């Protein structure tokens, strides 16, 4: 298995409120992957863009991992690694940013 605690963008289990305060002051492109407290073993991407903190569901269906149906990956790591180099705009027109800065900076 993959130990995600070794990555500077993994916040573990964390509420949305706790995330909004952690990313409100950082630059656009600052992000973190967190476990949703209300959904066990389901994760979300939280990305700072403009002056808001967006939250994207990480869906797991039919052994694929994806934030959009049109682009799927074999693991959460491959998903995060892809959007570190490709903007979210390709599937979220209002989110023209990559996963630029891990929130542990």
């Amino acid at each position: 298995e993959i130990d995600y605690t070794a990555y500077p963008w993994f916040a573990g289990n964390m509420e949305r409120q706790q995330t909004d305060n952690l990313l409100k002051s950082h630059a656009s492109g600052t992000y973190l992957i967190r476990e949703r407290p209300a959904e066990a073993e389901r994760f979300a991407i939280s990305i700072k863009f403009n002056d808001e903190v967006k939250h994207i569901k990480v869906v797991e269906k039919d052994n694929w991992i994806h934030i959009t149906e049109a682009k799927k990956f074999d693991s959460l790591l491959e998903l995060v690694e892809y959007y570190q180099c490709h903007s979210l705009k390709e599937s979220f027109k209002q989110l023209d940013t990559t996963l630029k800065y891990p929130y542990k900076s």
Binding site: A44, K54, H55, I56, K57, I67, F92, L95
Partner: peptide, 5 residues
Amino acid sequence: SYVGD
């Protein structure tokens, strides 16, 4: 509440 939905 989430971008997707």
